Amino acid sequence: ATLKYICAECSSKLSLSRTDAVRCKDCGHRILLKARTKRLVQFEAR
């Protein structure tokens, strides 16, 4: 059950927004990664 964001540093699926901060959960680190779609992406191998 889900993903939205990631901790640049302490490596750990976060998931949060607005009035929420922009920090973390078991690293207090202020940099955050978006995190990959599940819509599947295709490549031509050319």
Binding site: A8, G28, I31
Partner: protein, 36 residues
């Protein structure tokens, strides 16, 4: 100098990514002594 939760070691990797300014601060040793 933070937004909130305050004053922290900064590595160069993070200053780059947060648009920070890899800075340290300056401290003198001051003296009051009286003369007009």
């Amino acid at each position: 100098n933070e937004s909130d939760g305050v004053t922290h070691a900064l590595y160069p990797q993070e200053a780059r990514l947060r648009n920070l300014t890899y800075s340290s601060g300056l401290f003198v040793d001051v003296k009051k002594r009286t003369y007009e």
